[PDB]
Amino acid sequence: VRLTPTMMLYSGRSQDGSHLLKSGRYLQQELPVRIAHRIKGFRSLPFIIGCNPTILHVHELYIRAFQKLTDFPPIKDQADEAQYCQLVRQLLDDHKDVVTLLAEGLRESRKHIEDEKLVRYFLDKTLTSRLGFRMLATHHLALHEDKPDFVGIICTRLSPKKIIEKWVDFARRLCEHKYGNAPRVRINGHVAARFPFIPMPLDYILPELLKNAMRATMESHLDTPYNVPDVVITIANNDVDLIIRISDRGGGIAHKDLDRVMDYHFTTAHGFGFGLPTSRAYAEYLGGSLQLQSLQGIGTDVYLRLRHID
Amino acid sequence: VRLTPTMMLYSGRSQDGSHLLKSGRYLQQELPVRIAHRIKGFRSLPFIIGCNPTILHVHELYIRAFQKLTDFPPIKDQADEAQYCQLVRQLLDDHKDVVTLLAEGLRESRKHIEDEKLVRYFLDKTLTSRLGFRMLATHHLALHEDKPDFVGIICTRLSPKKIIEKWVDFARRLCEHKYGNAPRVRINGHVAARFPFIPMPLDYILPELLKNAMRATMESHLDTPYNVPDVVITIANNDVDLIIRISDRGGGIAHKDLDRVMDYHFTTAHGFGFGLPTSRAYAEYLGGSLQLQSLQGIGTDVYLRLRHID
Ligand SMILES: Nc1ncnc2c1ncn2[C@@H]1O[C@H](COP(=O)(O)OP(=O)(O)O)[C@@H](O)[C@H]1O
Ligand SMILES: Nc1ncnc2c1ncn2[C@@H]1O[C@H](COP(=O)(O)OP(=O)(O)O)[C@@H](O)[C@H]1O
Ligand SMILES: O=C(O)c1sc2cc(Cl)ccc2c1Cl
Ligand SMILES: O=C(O)c1sc2cc(Cl)ccc2c1Cl
Ligand SMILES: [K+]
Ligand SMILES: [K+]
Numbered sequence: 001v002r003l004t005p006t007m008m009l010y011s012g013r014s015q016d017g018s019h020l021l022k023s024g025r026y027l028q029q030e031l032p033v034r035i036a037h038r039i040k041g042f043r044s045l046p047f048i049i050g051c052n053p054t055i056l057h058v059h060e061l062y063i064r065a066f067q068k069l070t071d072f073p074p075i076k077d078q079a080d081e082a083q084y085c086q087l088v089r090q091l092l093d094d095h096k097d098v099v100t101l102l103a104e105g106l107r108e109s110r111k112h113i114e115d116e117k118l119v120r121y122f123l124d125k126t127l128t129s130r131l132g133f134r135m136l137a138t139h140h141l142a143l144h145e146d147k148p149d150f151v152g153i154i155c156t157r158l159s160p161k162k163i164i165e166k167w168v169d170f171a172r173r174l175c176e177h178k179y180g181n182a183p184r185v186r187i188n189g190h191v192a193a194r195f196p197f198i199p200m201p202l203d204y205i206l207p208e209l210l211k212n213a214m215r216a217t218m219e220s221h222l223d224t225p226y227n228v229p230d231v232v233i234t235i236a237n238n239d240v241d242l243i244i245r246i247s248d249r250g251g252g253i254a255h256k257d258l259d260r261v262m263d264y265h266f267t268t269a270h271g272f273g274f275g276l277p278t279s280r281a282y283a284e285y286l287g288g289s290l291q292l293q294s295l296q297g298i299g300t301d302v303y304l305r306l307r308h309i310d
Numbered sequence: 311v312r313l314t315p316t317m318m319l320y321s322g323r324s325q326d327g328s329h330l331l332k333s334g335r336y337l338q339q340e341l342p343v344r345i346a347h348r349i350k351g352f353r354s355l356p357f358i359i360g361c362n363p364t365i366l367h368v369h370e371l372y373i374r375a376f377q378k379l380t381d382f383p384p385i386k387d388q389a390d391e392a393q394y395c396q397l398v399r400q401l402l403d404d405h406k407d408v409v410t411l412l413a414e415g416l417r418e419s420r421k422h423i424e425d426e427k428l429v430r431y432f433l434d435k436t437l438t439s440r441l442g443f444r445m446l447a448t449h450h451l452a453l454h455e456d457k458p459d460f461v462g463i464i465c466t467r468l469s470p471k472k473i474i475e476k477w478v479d480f481a482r483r484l485c486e487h488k489y490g491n492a493p494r495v496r497i498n499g500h501v502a503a504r505f506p507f508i509p510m511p512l513d514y515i516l517p518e519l520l521k522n523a524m525r526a527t528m529e530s531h532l533d534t535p536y537n538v539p540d541v542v543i544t545i546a547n548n549d550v551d552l553i554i555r556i557s558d559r560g561g562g563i564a565h566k567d568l569d570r571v572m573d574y575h576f577t578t579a580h581g582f583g584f585g586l587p588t589s590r591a592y593a594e595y596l597g598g599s600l601q602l603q604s605l606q607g608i609g610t611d612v613y614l615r616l617r618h619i620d
């Protein structure tokens with residue numbers, strides 16, 4: 001019965017599999033309405049934006065998704081549900097490039113309107129409903145599996161340190177490939193903490209912020225790539241939220257860029273311009289936040305806050 | 311000709327002392343108008359607040375100050391100016407307890423109105439005009455002196471590290487007296503920096519924040535007062551501003567208190583409740599800011615930003 005924003009992830013067990021049917025019907029009740037909501041969003045886009053071929057592509061994908069979902073017969077038995085799972089999987093696969101297509105689509109078309117507020121509002125709303133969609137969908141699929149410490153996509157005892165480490169190794173590799181080195185990362189504060197949590201949003205955000213911190217460190221120690229300052233991560237765990245402070249000595253975000261870094265499409269180039277604003281939208285959708293503190297000339301502290309599960 | 315908020319501190323020299331006369335006339339032109347502005351502020355206070363004996367005391371002090379200032383004859387020669395200096399000194403002495411009297415005065419009387427916004431607005435405005443007053447006045451007096459590296463109260467080559475150190479020693483002493491120990495303080499980033507700057511606002515703010523950070527550290531290591539985590543201060547110096555990050559491992563500001571810590575009179579007790587909101591008002595008056603980042607369960611980062619001199 002664990003819930004986030006007006007939407008619940010179904011926590012429940014049964015040896016026969018009656019939990020699968022109620023979950024499946026929930027998705028069948030929930031998904032279509034929300035795709036429809038996002039189709040209106042496409043219909044309300046400024047005409048010249050909505051006309052861009054890629055914007056239209058994604059537009060069509062969303063209609064197709066609605067069509068397929070509503071055409072599916074109401075679920076009554078395991079064999080129905082099992083086959084609905086096939087459709088959910090197909091949809092996930094089909095829609096995996098959507099963020100990128102949206103980025104490409106809006107890149108040019110966005111300058112052609114005077115209303116700056118509109119695209120931000122559209123992306124925030126589209127991308128966050130989509131996260132909610134992938135969460136709900138991946139959860140249902142995961143409910144089939146019998147993995148240790150997981151009720152669906154909900155880890156019962158998640159380790160912030162362990163997940164940070166997963167993404168550190170990843171980001172370091174990428175950085176080594178581009179620069180020949182990467183900063184070491186140290187992790188302090190509540191390194192021993194374990195609690196119920198959904199990893200998925202951490203899996204988008206963490207690598208984004210790690211990417212940014214590593215780039216900035218390297219791009220400001222171009223004379224000594226072999227010796228760079230560590231990035232330092234602090235985990236704080238309390239009864240209300242989890243806070244992860246990612247703090248670097250990469251020179252800061254310049255005063256001139258400060259007001260634009262949270263803008264979609266804005267970048268100083270790991271070069272697409274979506275890391276910061278997507279991450280923030282995700283965090284706020286989940287009831288937390290993402291806040292920057294620039295120390296121009298020294299570095300940046302990035303604060304990720306996510307609410308605990310009720 | 312160095313200026314801050316619609317007001318200029320006079321930078322100039324002369325062996326005969328013609329710079330003193332123009333400065334004196336400036337003060338004579340400026341102070342009265344601004345005292346008058348603050349008298350209206352007293353006149354507009356909710357009646358039941360304005361009636362409190364201490365509030366009235368300060369009210370009278372401001373009238374007396376206006377009376378004395380406007381009664382002073384226009385300045386024409388050194389001997390005039392010299393005597394105006396005596397009056398400025400007297401006013402400074404007379405008004406030194408004003409913040410405290412205001413705190414005592416408003417403590418009870420403030421609950422008696424429904425408008426929470428009003429007292430904050432009154433204090434911010436009164437206390438910041440007063441800082442501007444003491445700055446202008448102390449500057450003029452200082453212009454008599456011939457100290458190295460000082461044009462008035464404007465240090466020509468101020469060292470952030472050195473001023474932080476001054477206030478560290480101070481705060482540590484206070485903390486040792488109360489707890490039997492204090493955290494060591496380390497200072498990193500641009501420790502070698504020197505630039506023109508006015509120390510005065512740093513002299514109010516720095517000890518306030520150092521006080522808060524030391525208390526929190528001790529009040530959360532009550533089992534090991536002999537061994538506490540360091541407070542760590544980071545100086546960043548760029549072309550736009552000076553940033554001083556004061557960061558502690560004192561457990562954070564709790565979610566419940568977070569919205570109230572910037573309120574005048576609010577405190578969890580070094581016990582008066584004015585440190586944070588006064589400091590922030592001062593910083594914003596000077597064109598910078600003061601921002602908190604709580605890591606509940608771990609500690610707090612406090613970010614002080616002050617603009618450089620034009
Ligand atoms: N830790 C950081 N240090 C310095 N600059 C940063 C940091 N994080 C983000 N930025 C700046 O803000 C911009 C926006 O970042 P983002 O939205 O992730 O897009 P991208 O990283 O693809 O440019 C970056 O291009 C970079 O200029
Ligand atoms: N570094 C800090 N760590 C923990 N709590 C703090 C810190 N700074 C301020 N606070 C909290 O916010 C309150 C407001 O501080 P302030 O305005 O300086 O008043 P006072 O220190 O007199 O209580 C403090 O009482 C304390 O509870
Ligand atoms: O945009 C996406 O990634 C997804 S995944 C997904 C899964 C389902 Cl079951 C329905 C819609 C939908 C969308 Cl839209
Ligand atoms: O409130 C204060 O501290 C001061 S000092 C001060 C000095 C002068 Cl010259 C005039 C007013 C004035 C006030 Cl009000
Ligand atoms: K961006
Ligand atoms: K306070």
Ligand SMILES: [Mg+2]
Nearest residue numbers: 212270275276
């Ligand atoms: Mg990025």
Ligand SMILES: [Mg+2]
Nearest residue numbers: 522580585586
């Ligand atoms: Mg205080």
